[PDB]
Design a protein around this nucleic acid. Sequence first.
RNA 1: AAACUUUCAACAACGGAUCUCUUGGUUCUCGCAUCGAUGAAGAACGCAGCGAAAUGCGAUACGUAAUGUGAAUUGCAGAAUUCCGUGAAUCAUCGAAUCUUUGAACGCACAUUGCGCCCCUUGGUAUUCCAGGGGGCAUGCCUGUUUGAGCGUCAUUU
RNA 2: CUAUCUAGCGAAACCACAGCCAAGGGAACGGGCUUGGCAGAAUCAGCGGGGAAAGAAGACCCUGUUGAGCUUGACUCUAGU
RNA 3: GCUUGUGACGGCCCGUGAAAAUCCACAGGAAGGAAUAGUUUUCAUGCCAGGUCGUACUGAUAACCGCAGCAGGUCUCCAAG
RNA 4: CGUGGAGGUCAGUGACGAAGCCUAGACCGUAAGGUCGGGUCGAACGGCCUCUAGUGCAGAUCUUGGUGGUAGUAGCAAAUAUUCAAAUGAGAACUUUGAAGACUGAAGUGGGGAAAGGUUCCACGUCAACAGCAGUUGGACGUGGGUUAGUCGAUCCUAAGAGAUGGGGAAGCUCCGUUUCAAAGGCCUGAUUUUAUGCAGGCCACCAUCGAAAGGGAAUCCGGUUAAGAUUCCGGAACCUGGAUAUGGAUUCUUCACGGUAACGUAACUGAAUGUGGAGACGUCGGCGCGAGCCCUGGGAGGAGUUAUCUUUUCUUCUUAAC
RNA 5: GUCGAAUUUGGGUAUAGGGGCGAAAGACUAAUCGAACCAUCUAGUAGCUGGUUCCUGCCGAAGUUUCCCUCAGGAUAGCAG
RNA 6: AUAUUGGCGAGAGACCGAUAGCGAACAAGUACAGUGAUGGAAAGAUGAAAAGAACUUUGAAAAGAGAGUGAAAAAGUACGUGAAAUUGUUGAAAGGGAAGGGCAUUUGAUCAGA
Lengths: 50, 101, 71, 119, 84
Amino acid sequence: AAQKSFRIKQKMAKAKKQNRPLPQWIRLRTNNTIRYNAKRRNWRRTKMNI
Amino acid sequence: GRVIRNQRKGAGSIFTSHTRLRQGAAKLRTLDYAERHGYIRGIVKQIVHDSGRGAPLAKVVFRDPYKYRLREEIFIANEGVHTGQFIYAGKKASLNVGNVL
Amino acid sequence: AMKKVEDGNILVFQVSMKANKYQIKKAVKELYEVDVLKVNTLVRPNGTKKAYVRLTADYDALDIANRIGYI
Amino acid sequence: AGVKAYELRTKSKEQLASQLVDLKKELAELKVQKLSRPSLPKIKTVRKSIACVLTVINEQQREAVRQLYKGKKYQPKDLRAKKTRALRRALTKFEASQVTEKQRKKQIAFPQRKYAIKA
Amino acid sequence: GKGTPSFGKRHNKSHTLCNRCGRRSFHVQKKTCSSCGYPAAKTRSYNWGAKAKRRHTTGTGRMRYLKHVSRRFKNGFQTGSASK
RNA sequence: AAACUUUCAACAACGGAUCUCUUGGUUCUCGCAUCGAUGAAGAACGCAGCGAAAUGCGAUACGUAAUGUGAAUUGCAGAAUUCCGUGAAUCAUCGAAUCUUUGAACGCACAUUGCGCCCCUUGGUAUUCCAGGGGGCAUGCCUGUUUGAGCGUCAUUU
RNA sequence: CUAUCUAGCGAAACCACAGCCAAGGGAACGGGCUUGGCAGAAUCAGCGGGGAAAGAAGACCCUGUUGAGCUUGACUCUAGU
RNA sequence: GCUUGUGACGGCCCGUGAAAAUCCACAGGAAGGAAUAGUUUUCAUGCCAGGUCGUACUGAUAACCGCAGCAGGUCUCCAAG
RNA sequence: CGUGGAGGUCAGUGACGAAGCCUAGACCGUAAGGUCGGGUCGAACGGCCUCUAGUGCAGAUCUUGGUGGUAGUAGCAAAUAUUCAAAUGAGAACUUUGAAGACUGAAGUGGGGAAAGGUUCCACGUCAACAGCAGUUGGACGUGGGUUAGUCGAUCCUAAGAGAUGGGGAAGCUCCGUUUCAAAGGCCUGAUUUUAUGCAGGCCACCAUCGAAAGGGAAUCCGGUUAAGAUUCCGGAACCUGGAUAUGGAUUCUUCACGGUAACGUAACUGAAUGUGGAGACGUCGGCGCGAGCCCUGGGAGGAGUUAUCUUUUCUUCUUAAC
RNA sequence: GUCGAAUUUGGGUAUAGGGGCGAAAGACUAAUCGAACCAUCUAGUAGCUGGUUCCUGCCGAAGUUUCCCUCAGGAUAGCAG
RNA sequence: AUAUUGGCGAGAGACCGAUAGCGAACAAGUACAGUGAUGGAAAGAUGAAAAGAACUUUGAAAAGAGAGUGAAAAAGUACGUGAAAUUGUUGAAAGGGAAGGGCAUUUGAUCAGA
Ligand SMILES: [K+]
Ligand SMILES: [Mg+2]
Ligand SMILES: [Mg+2]
Ligand SMILES: [Mg+2]
Ligand SMILES: [Mg+2]
Ligand SMILES: [Mg+2]
Ligand SMILES: [Mg+2]
Ligand SMILES: [Mg+2]
Ligand SMILES: [Mg+2]
Ligand SMILES: [Mg+2]
Ligand SMILES: [Mg+2]
Ligand SMILES: [Mg+2]
Ligand SMILES: [Mg+2]
Ligand SMILES: [Mg+2]
Ligand SMILES: [Mg+2]
Ligand SMILES: [Mg+2]
Ligand SMILES: [Mg+2]
Ligand SMILES: [Mg+2]
Ligand SMILES: [Mg+2]
Ligand SMILES: [Mg+2]
Ligand SMILES: [Mg+2]
Ligand SMILES: [Mg+2]
Ligand SMILES: [Mg+2]
Ligand SMILES: [Mg+2]
Ligand SMILES: [Mg+2]
Ligand SMILES: [Mg+2]
Ligand SMILES: [Mg+2]
Ligand SMILES: [Mg+2]
Ligand SMILES: [Mg+2]
Ligand SMILES: [Mg+2]
Ligand SMILES: [Mg+2]
Ligand SMILES: [Mg+2]
Ligand SMILES: [Mg+2]
Ligand SMILES: [Mg+2]
Ligand SMILES: [Mg+2]
Ligand SMILES: [Mg+2]
Ligand SMILES: [Mg+2]
Ligand SMILES: [Mg+2]
Ligand SMILES: [Mg+2]
Ligand SMILES: [Mg+2]
Ligand SMILES: [Mg+2]
Ligand SMILES: [Mg+2]
Ligand SMILES: [Mg+2]
Ligand SMILES: [Mg+2]
Ligand SMILES: [Mg+2]
Ligand SMILES: [Mg+2]
Ligand SMILES: [Mg+2]
Ligand SMILES: [Mg+2]
Ligand SMILES: [Mg+2]
Ligand SMILES: [Mg+2]
Ligand SMILES: [Mg+2]
Ligand SMILES: [Mg+2]
Ligand SMILES: [Mg+2]
Ligand SMILES: [Mg+2]
Ligand SMILES: [Mg+2]
Ligand SMILES: [Mg+2]
Ligand SMILES: [Mg+2]
Ligand SMILES: [Zn+2]
């Protein structure tokens, strides 16, 4: 809203920091059934609902 | 099968009185020693409109008999009462329009 | 931040989110033996705190940065 | 290889405070270096050394306070035994072994005897 | 109206984040969380809501003290040190 | 006669059945009794050389201490190979600590990272203003302490 | 501006199997059955006769010892007073 | 002239059109006050400090809601010839 | 007859290939089915005697998943509209630049904001997916950068209202009520300074708290600066609040100022309790007056355009913040 | 149609399901209204509709009697194995 | 002595074998939907070992063709097997307003038995 509470900004900061693809050195680990970031969010597809 | 309007009025959600603009409750002075035994003189400072009320109110200022200060009272103005008029309230006040007896 | 250090005599620090301007000023003074003219603070979009610490005209933020290890 | 708690334990609190200050300065300069140098794992060692020095300092302080409070009742609650809350509320061994004078007399007089059947 | 045109007037949050559970179920005007019941002392739950109980019950977090209570019991709530 | 349509076969597709797997579930039995104001369960936010999660953890932050084992960790990097050693480890064990902001949640509030008060201490001449550090201030109830109230009331002076 | 034709892109409804008629009989109005008429690949734009076309377990009517909204000196109760 | 601010007025009401924080002034005269000197931080100048959180951008025929980059919906300011 | 599992047995089959699957190839059975060959495949499985059942599918507008015909079909037609060249690139109707033609036409298709979103902002790289054509472009993808305040907001106040406490109700979760049937008080100071407190002099209480990013409200402007921040940064110039404070000035010998008839004036020019008053603080419409910005316009000092002809001409700069 | 007042509208706030709210249409109460939404009781009951999965062999019906708040059902006798 | 769909620790089964079994064998009460109470999935398998295809060549590239690794690439991370629906190619055959079917035989193809 550009006049946001610190709580909202903090959740926004966490979302920005976790908005990234899978680290590519994962998928080299020994067993590693993890293929991709299945929790990837985008502002155009799914709303954070705060 | 439904609760009717006169029944709904008792809950007082949207049926409470719109009291924002009102001047205050219109009351005589508290019945005290001065009015029980003699009289007390106040002065009419304002005759003012009260929202939701037809009759105008008179703001009458008396001296506090026990503490040095003024006590404003909200009377309902009687016809002929004017600002600057001395109102007398008590057992010994005179039979004059605006006096409290 | 490097442009600010070189041009505006302003050291740019990441500081604790619990620290206020008084704590930042006194910490910079203690850690770097430098007088602080002003501290401006913002909370970055990544949730950390960035402090623009403008030093007094006596000190040169570029040499302070050189001393503390980033040129 | 980082600091060792058993070596720290032989040092006075002044030396430990000084070592903590030096380790903090070292960590600050190491995270300055990390901004240029990529993949600098040496900072983990200094972080663990700071943790170890703080651990030993707190150990010494808490031991000194335990010595201060030795023997007298009313120790500080974080120095008292942390059993469960119900266990700390439970009757002590002295209580729940308290018996009336009547009960003591009668169970002294007639305890459970040892007896076998021998035919 | 009442469909697509009326959906355009949805910009005022009835609920915001709850301090206790973080679920965005704290009714702004009622000042009450519809999920955990904050600020009531008890945590809202119902036996008709077995799935919700399962969602929010003990063990759904990290348990942070209780995960060690069992080992401490096993060792008898000892208090000293292992004495090399 | 082609094309086209249809049927079948082979190979290729589509799709993920079947078969065989199984660190999962389900049911039965046996043993045990241990959450929390010494702050629980739950929540938020952070923490790794390179992690978004799961898991672990709390500014001592995938951990500190202690003990045991005895040479790893491993995806890369780095370190190390004294490793015949108070000593590797994303090991096990775990009795000592740390344990952000919270939460029954406790100075007052909380759609605010809002606003006080007390003590010690430090700096700015500084009991009074501002700031930093440390320690505190919820409610009900119980035992006790101290200070009190009531012609409720006793005695003495009167 | 479409429709139309092209390059690119590219759904859905619906679909027992399908698709030329006439009469017959038939669940008394057939695309199939019987008897006839006939009948030649593959198709394009239109069209609204038919597919008793599609859309929906008919909302009318009836049945159910299936309800619900409403009413009333129906039966049985009840807050209040 | 337009937009806007404002002043003095006028019309209207069985409508007469918030509250509190906060600031000032007055009444009063408590108290405190001068003579090798007392008084005065509502006069002037001079010294120090002012924490915390928000702050980018869109605000819509593509940044909100409507399953979407949906001809829908969604409050307001400025406004040239 | 067949299927999953179970007891027994055939010292059954099997990596020299179990199971599964495919096979207009063969055999047996009326049939349910059984057997064999070939191909594929890779780790188990079968005959018989018995035991047992979550044991046999074509349907249930069956369930889940997958796939068709329809069909390269319906269609991708509102919002006037695009065109030329160059550059880039493997590739250009759609990207970039230039040129042209248009539109929104200030109640905008402009410049900002509130709610909401949450990084969409900006740069670099970059086109598998997405942008119902395309794509070298993008609100996409990948990596980073970016939001600076004593003065703008929140913070403070109260509004409708919400809501602890004291009490009362309720089995109870809890409900009522908000100053009420309460012993609900701190801030001042003579003295005490055995210490500025306790005792001990004296003055004021019908009461938590929450509730507005549009109400009320202490105080900041101009210029410049970024890829992206600006009333926040830089430069300059102010202001307010809280505090500390020393000079100058003022006042006093008639101690707490003088002047003016007066309205009142000023650089000041003591003032506790208590009280009173004012501001905060207020509707709407109408015409009239005034200001500011804009519009129009004259001269002049500059720059640009037109100039076959005419046009002392058409357009444009000439500004001044808070304090 | 209306367009300066029974006006339009933002935000805040109150009213919650046999309840609210209604200038009254059984309207509106988050695409839900002649009783919202969510979960549970609940796999609610159904004389009613649909379906009900291998082969072969042998035998092989009834739509009638009586009774029923029975007439789309059951009991009973009959027919069948 | 009795209870125990919770907690902790154990042992089992004529149980289920990824549409089954808990909703969840997997970063499952997750992703996601809803204002909210709540609702709530899908998703396991290369190979013994990545030995995860060096190198050449065509292509802007994706990729292709080779080469190679491997027991196998008829195992290439779009990975065990790899059904059917549906589809391409090749081969065969038939075809005047459906197709399919029964009895019988011709023709073509194919095949067991002595
Ligand atoms: K009804
Ligand atoms: Mg700031
Ligand atoms: Mg509706
Ligand atoms: Mg609301
Ligand atoms: Mg804690
Ligand atoms: Mg016919
Ligand atoms: Mg006929
Ligand atoms: Mg037909
Ligand atoms: Mg015929
Ligand atoms: Mg034909
Ligand atoms: Mg037509
Ligand atoms: Mg027709
Ligand atoms: Mg029907
Ligand atoms: Mg129906
Ligand atoms: Mg009947
Ligand atoms: Mg009924
Ligand atoms: Mg206007
Ligand atoms: Mg901005
Ligand atoms: Mg903007
Ligand atoms: Mg705009
Ligand atoms: Mg959207
Ligand atoms: Mg089974
Ligand atoms: Mg085989
Ligand atoms: Mg076949
Ligand atoms: Mg195998
Ligand atoms: Mg079955
Ligand atoms: Mg089937
Ligand atoms: Mg059937
Ligand atoms: Mg079906
Ligand atoms: Mg289906
Ligand atoms: Mg078309
Ligand atoms: Mg169209
Ligand atoms: Mg158009
Ligand atoms: Mg262009
Ligand atoms: Mg136009
Ligand atoms: Mg135009
Ligand atoms: Mg951009
Ligand atoms: Mg496209
Ligand atoms: Mg494309
Ligand atoms: Mg991006
Ligand atoms: Mg302000
Ligand atoms: Mg209440
Ligand atoms: Mg407030
Ligand atoms: Mg305001
Ligand atoms: Mg900007
Ligand atoms: Mg400045
Ligand atoms: Mg003077
Ligand atoms: Mg009607
Ligand atoms: Mg059933
Ligand atoms: Mg027979
Ligand atoms: Mg009967
Ligand atoms: Mg029937
Ligand atoms: Mg499952
Ligand atoms: Mg598979
Ligand atoms: Mg093989
Ligand atoms: Mg395969
Ligand atoms: Mg097939
Ligand atoms: Zn909650």
